[PDB]
Amino acid sequence: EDIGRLQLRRAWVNYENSGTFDIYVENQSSNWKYTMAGARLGSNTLRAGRLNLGTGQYRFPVVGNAKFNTVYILSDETTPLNIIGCGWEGNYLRR
Amino acid sequence: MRSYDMNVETAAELSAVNDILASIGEPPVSTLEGDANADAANARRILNKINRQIQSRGWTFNIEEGITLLPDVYSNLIVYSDDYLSLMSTSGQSIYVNRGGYVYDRTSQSDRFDSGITVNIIRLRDYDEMPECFRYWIVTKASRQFNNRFFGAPEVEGVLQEEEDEARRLCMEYEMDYGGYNMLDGDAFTSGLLTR
Amino acid sequence: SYDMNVETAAELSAVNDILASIGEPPVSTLEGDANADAANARRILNKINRQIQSRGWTFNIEEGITLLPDVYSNLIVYSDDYLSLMSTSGQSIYVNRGGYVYDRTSQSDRFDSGITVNIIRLRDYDEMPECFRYWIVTKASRQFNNRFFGAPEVEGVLQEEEDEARRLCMEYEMDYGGYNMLDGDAFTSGLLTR
Amino acid sequence: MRSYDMNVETAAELSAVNDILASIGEPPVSTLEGDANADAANARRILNKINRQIQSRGWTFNIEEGITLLPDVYSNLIVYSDDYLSLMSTSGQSIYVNRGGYVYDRTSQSDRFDSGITVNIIRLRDYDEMPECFRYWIVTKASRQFNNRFFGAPEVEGVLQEEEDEARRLCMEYEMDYGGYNMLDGDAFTSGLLTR
Amino acid sequence: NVIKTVLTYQLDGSNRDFNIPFEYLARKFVVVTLIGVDRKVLTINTDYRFATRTTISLTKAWGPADGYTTIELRRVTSTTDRLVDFTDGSILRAYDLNVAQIQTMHVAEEARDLT
Amino acid sequence: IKTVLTYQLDGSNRDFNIPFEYLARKFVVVTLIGVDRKVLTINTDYRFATRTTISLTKAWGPADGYTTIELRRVTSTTDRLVDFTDGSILRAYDLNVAQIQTMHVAEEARDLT
Amino acid sequence: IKTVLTYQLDGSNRDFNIPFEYLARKFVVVTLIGVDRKVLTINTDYRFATRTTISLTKAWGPADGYTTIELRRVTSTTDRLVDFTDGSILRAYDLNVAQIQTMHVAEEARDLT
Amino acid sequence: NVIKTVLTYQLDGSNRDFNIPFEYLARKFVVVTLIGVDRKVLTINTDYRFATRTTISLTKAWGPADGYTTIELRRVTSTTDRLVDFTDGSILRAYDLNVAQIQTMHVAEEARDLT
């Protein structure tokens, strides 16, 4: 649907048995990283000495024109990354 | 009028553009100069237009009382530039109008002036050089138009309408505090009556 | 051991309330890697804090403080810190022109011996009364979802909450001010003296 | 502000979290410490925020009349900690404000005090160490926000708004009962008039 | 310049309650002494009780009697003893990590303030 | 390597580099010396063209005796750059700057002795 | 036990025991006092007989005017025994030594005052 | 017929502020001189300032004193120096293009007015 302007509010990436990764969001002007490292403080699977990688959904704020901002994921930190989904939310008034 | 990119960037204008952009939902822009963002350029164009309009309405700090406009002695005619938002006489009836970009005396049918004139002028200022209370009204009006023109969302449109109405109320509240107008002694007519 | 009195950073906790206003998980820090919500929430929080302070409150307005020009230039600086300049009595004359204090009536931006004005000066998110600190957060929380991610039910409640928060900050100001129509005011006080 | 887990669990606080959790529909949690429940932690955050907010409004048991704040004799300046929700002078006009975390006399332009000051302070308390009538109002308000923020259900939201209005009504009813204010003899002005 | 950790209150007669502004990682870290004759450190059990996270209460009213003119209350943070210890089984809390830096930052306050 | 150091003005020099590494612009504190200990608003009086180099912006410090400038890093312990909150993802960034802050705070206290 | 302590030189006394705990050998610095401060290499100038005691190989002695031997632990703030990366486990041993390393730097500051 | 770039204002006593109608590419292009004895070109640093894009403020009160009857305000555009330069890495924008023609058009303005 080329007609209209879509203002996308956010996005999410589904990962399974995966470690760290950085989800770069680059609009025309600025850029953002949103690193996902660990389980999150206060979570059963965060406990020390444990391998720390697991299945979950990561939701990151991506805001812009839906046509000028590029979202690309990359990671180096020696840990498997299996992406089993992706999505986004937007407003999309047609004009 | 003047180009949007002509104006020098300041911290006040940078936040104003960020606020206008957020109305649609665009992320804030770090710097205004040297960017390819089309939305950021528009927000400055909308901001400058609303800045000029809100200044055009007569405000106490905006209106200059009895300032003297000096003509070129060789030319004998005063320049009525676009920077002059309003030109009115200090007395009741204003006699100065614009003909060909120069101040024209309609009652005298002559645009050649000697020794200068005393008038009330509203002169345009930047987005800076403006009262803080007025800065949020300019932004609130501008974001309303910016949302309307480019990404018209009814949900945010209704919220901005009451935000502007409150913004106007505060600005009037600022004007009354700034003016300090007295209906007994500050009044021109009533002051002469109170003499005893 | 729960005996501690350790307190968290107020600026991040205020931002977390803006993030948590929609249910987003809190962010552990502000400075560091760029984050959209952390950058948006922090900017709106500072914007609203400036907005609320500009309105003028009894603690906010500083009465009769003098501004001194530079000795050589004879110009006073109208800094971005100054949220308002007004004359002590009435019919405020000093205005901004070129970033310097300008006397519109006297048509001269050059002053000597200083001037006396009522200035509202910017303060941090801290150094504000608790009534106002809540109002800024709940105003920024409402502003946050209107612009970026719109939740209809969250907006409905936050509008009611903001009105309630605004009402409380007014009651703080009347309690703080303690204004008296009989003796406190300038006019009637002279009349009552007998 | 303090972290949610900083506070000691009490059977009073445990019940409040269960009430807040039940608003969405989550089952009650038996023990607050040693849990991985994210929702239980959030209920602590909402409870503490609402606790501080409702305490901030002036209540006769909350307000302490004419308590003395003592400065450090070496430093000569008083500390205006975040625990102090409100600082007001006992007389009509309040002259103490916060600058840099220290009490500041705006009328005197000095933050250095000697011999201490007498002021009215609202001081923060735990969720416990609160009137029981206020505990349900704190829960009911926190229940509304907790439902709103995480799982916003219109059906339960409407009921809680009615429940909160009744909760406020009872708390005011407690306030008048606790206060026992008399317009004839408890009144400052009218008491002097009744002398015969 | 201001000394946050160490601060003294003039007794000015019978003042039961005194405010402790500084943060403290343990109830044992705050130490209260009277000043005017000798540095007499007070016992936590009987001599003084807190009754509140932020203010203390002293049983007897020293005032100007016994030659004690002022009260001195300060925080001393035990270097050897660590409030938080990490074990493999235990879950990482925001509590546990925060106390790690906060304690060793409090010790740095004490060294800087005594200078 | 020392957080405490002093630069003599050595004529009207706008620029002075700071050797010590610092976390935030607020943490670095700079005072003009020569007649009396004068503290200056860093965000206003100086410009950071680079992180290390401060700018007097106008040959500040003239024959009035302000011929000495003091460079210090005072990292505030009360205001933590990172304080971990439950429900937030841990980050190697957050753990590193949390350690680097208290090391900066401890290092400043050690040099003050 | 003080992290900083100076021992009487006592003529030709080769060995000196230190009570303070130290994470690494490189942290401990031994200097010569009496005429000027002299820094000594870890391995050539002295040797660690055990963890607790240190023996000076060259027996500098009272000769040249040095009258006392000063032994202090300095923990480098820039050099960290454990550093945190986004991947990997967060072992409890690493988090503990990270705690005690920055604790040691603060402990050195308090003893100096 | 009208001379837009060059215009003179009678001092008529002490008047601080004078309005410049012509548009100028740079503040260095606007030149201010007093008339009545000699053409004394004013320095921008101290003798006269602006405080506004269209207004200039003069420090001392010339008026009829010192024999300077009027003030002369004209704009001279430097031919040799170009305000805008184009490079391959540079992005074309409205600012750079508009300056290119209009600076040249200002130079032709002065030549026509001086005739």
UniProtKB/Swiss-Prot annotation, chain A:
It is found in: Virion. It comes from the Viruses. Interacts with head-to-tail connector protein gp8, the tail component gp11, and the fiber protein gp17. Structural component of the short non-contractile tail. The tail complex is involved in viral genome delivery. Forms the end of the tail, including the canonical tube, the nozzle, and the small extensions below the fibers. Once the tail tubular structure is formed, the interface between gp11 and gp12 generates the proper environment to interact with the six gp17 trimers. This is Tail tubular protein gp12. It comes from Escherichia phage T7.
Swiss-Prot record, chain C:
One of its GO terms (biological process) is symbiont genome ejection through host cell envelope, short tail mechanism. It is found in: Virion. It comes from the Viruses. One of its GO terms (cellular component) is virus tail, tube. The keyword Isomerase does not apply. Keywords: Viral genome ejection through host cell envelope, Viral penetration into host cytoplasm, Viral short tail ejection system, Viral tail protein, Viral tail tube protein, Virion, Virus entry into host cell. The keyword Repeat does not apply. Interacts with head-to-tail connector protein gp8, the tail component gp12, and the fiber protein gp17. Belongs to the tail tubular protein gp11 family. Structural component of the short non-contractile tail. The tail complex is involved in viral genome delivery. Forms the 12-fold symmetric toroidal domain immediately below the connector protein gp8. Once the tail tubular structure is formed, the interface between gp11 and gp12 generates the proper environment to interact with the six fibers, each made of gp17 trimers. This is Tail tubular protein gp11. It comes from Escherichia phage T7 (Bacteriophage T7).
Curated annotation (Swiss-Prot), chains E, H:
Transmembrane segments: none annotated. It comes from the Viruses. It is found in: Virion. Belongs to the Teseptimavirus fiber family. Homotrimer. Interacts with tail components gp11 and gp12. Structural component of the short non-contractile tail. The tail comprises six fibers made of gp17 trimers, 2 nm in diameter and 32 nm in length. May attach to host lipopolysaccharides (LPS) to mediate primary attachment to the host cell. This is Tail fiber protein. The lineage of its organism: Viruses, Duplodnaviria, Heunggongvirae, Uroviricota, Caudoviricetes. The chain holds residues 3 to 117 of 553 of the full protein.
